[PDB]
Design a protein around this motif. Structure first.
Motif, mmCIF file in Angstrom:
data_model
loop_
_atom_site.group_PDB
_atom_site.id
_atom_site.type_symbol
_atom_site.label_atom_id
_atom_site.label_comp_id
_atom_site.label_asym_id
_atom_site.label_seq_id
_atom_site.Cartn_x
_atom_site.Cartn_y
_atom_site.Cartn_z
ATOM 1 N N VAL B 56 66.421 21.028 149.260
ATOM 2 C CA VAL B 56 67.502 21.836 149.815
ATOM 3 C C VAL B 56 66.933 22.715 150.924
ATOM 4 N N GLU B 57 67.124 22.295 152.174
ATOM 5 C CA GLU B 57 66.860 23.129 153.340
ATOM 6 C C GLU B 57 68.169 23.767 153.785
ATOM 7 N N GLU B 58 68.163 25.089 153.954
ATOM 8 C CA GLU B 58 69.363 25.809 154.365
ATOM 9 C C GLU B 58 69.021 26.924 155.339
ATOM 10 N N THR B 59 69.785 26.999 156.428
ATOM 11 C CA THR B 59 69.752 28.154 157.314
ATOM 12 C C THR B 59 70.656 29.245 156.754
ATOM 13 N N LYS B 60 70.122 30.458 156.638
ATOM 14 C CA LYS B 60 70.822 31.547 155.965
ATOM 15 C C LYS B 60 71.431 32.571 156.909
ATOM 16 N N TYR C 10 75.009 27.694 157.612
ATOM 17 C CA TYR C 10 74.977 27.489 159.054
ATOM 18 C C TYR C 10 74.493 26.081 159.377
ATOM 19 N N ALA C 11 74.827 25.636 160.588
ATOM 20 C CA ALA C 11 74.350 24.376 161.143
ATOM 21 C C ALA C 11 74.222 24.548 162.649
ATOM 22 N N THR C 12 73.202 23.924 163.238
ATOM 23 C CA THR C 12 72.833 24.196 164.620
ATOM 24 C C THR C 12 72.625 22.903 165.399
ATOM 25 N N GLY C 13 73.089 22.897 166.650
ATOM 26 C CA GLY C 13 72.818 21.819 167.584
ATOM 27 C C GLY C 13 72.309 22.348 168.912
#
Ligand code: NAG
Ligand code: NAG
Ligand code: CA
Ligand code: CA
Ligand code: CA
Ligand code: CA
Ligand code: CA
Ligand code: CA
Lengths: 149, 116, 33, 58
Positions: B56-60, C10-13
């Motif tokens: 589980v990789e997550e940006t917080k 979040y998710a980034t491009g």
């Protein structure tokens, strides 16, 4: 019995910037040497531009610094600048003259061949004044950076 | 970077250690010296991602000079190896035109709001 | 007893544009004489 | 297709139900982009960020 605020935690990094975006070197080693009052055609040399870390596009302004001094010696004088550093894409970018000494050019991903340098040769067209003799007269060009990305 | 350049860089990682009878931690992260960094940058963004779990990789959170503070949650899934959190920092930036400097620090602060 | 806001995702491009639309090359090698 | 996002209307609300949860454990959603760039603008290393928030679960 001690009450804590629970905010005594830190982390530290660093940053720096200790150089200018571009470096410019000159190799103009040819002399415009016509007879008095003659109409001619001559090439001069080339100029090298070096681009540094995290630089992709450069906007430049080129002008003739000593156009006023050269006016009494010439009826007209035009300089042609062409980008050649890419063997596939040769492009003329600007034309300078004694009446319109300044121009703005754009260098992009296609120009930056070898990923590190720009090569620009100078092309000159001229007509000398009638009966005027002189020697050791310099021609000066100046560069200024307007925006880099 | 060079003066006035637009770039892309990574920084490192930060370790968090959790102790007896602790399961969930609520944290607040802020930029302590954002005011000092304003004259040197047009914009600067920091991206924090939890990776300590290989599955589980997550940006917080995303931090910036205009919105320096954020609140994140760490739960049972994040606490891999049962004892530590690993968070790397991701930076996006654009430097001011014609500004030269060296030895400038960037500071981050942590504060605990609730633990259970 | 912790209350969560449930918005920490979040998710980034990325995107870019680093060249001009056209390129022009000249081959005018004749003289009006 | 569940939602369309734009620079003028950046937010949308979607619903995931029993039919979406294939393999009983995960949802897969790809992103489709349509764009027109500004005239004469050059740039690089520009991020695009999306955010998720849970409103109700059952
Ligand atoms: C100079 O610009 C080129 C073309 O955009 C780029 O590939 C190169 O990395 C730049 N040089 C440096 C030292 O960053
Ligand atoms: C830290 O939290 C984890 C995950 O909830 C838990 O398993 C572990 O026991 C905690 N550590 C200690 C030292 O209590
Ligand atoms: Ca230099
Ligand atoms: Ca004549
Ligand atoms: Ca002649
Ligand atoms: Ca081009
Ligand atoms: Ca810039
Ligand atoms: Ca760049």
């Amino acid at each position: 019995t001690t009450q804590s605020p629970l905010n005594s935690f830190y982390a530290t990094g660093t940053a720096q910037a200790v150089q200018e975006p571009i470096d410019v070197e000159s190799h103009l080693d040819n002399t415009i040497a016509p007879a008095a009052g003659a109409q001619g055609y001559k090439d001069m040399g080339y100029v090298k531009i070096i681009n540094y870390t995290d630089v992709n596009v450069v906007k430049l302004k080129v002008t003739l610094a000593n156009a006023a001094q050269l006016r009494p010696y010439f009826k007209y004088l035009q300089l042609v600048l062409t980008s050649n550093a890419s063997s596939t894409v040769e492009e003329t970018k600007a034309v300078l003259s004694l009446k319109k000494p300044s121009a703005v050019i754009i260098l992009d991903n296609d120009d930056y061949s070898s990923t590190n340098k720009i090569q620009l040769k100078v092309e000159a067209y001229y007509e000398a004044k009638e009966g005027m003799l002189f020697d050791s007269l310099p021609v000066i060009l100046n560069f200024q950076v307007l925006s880099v990305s």
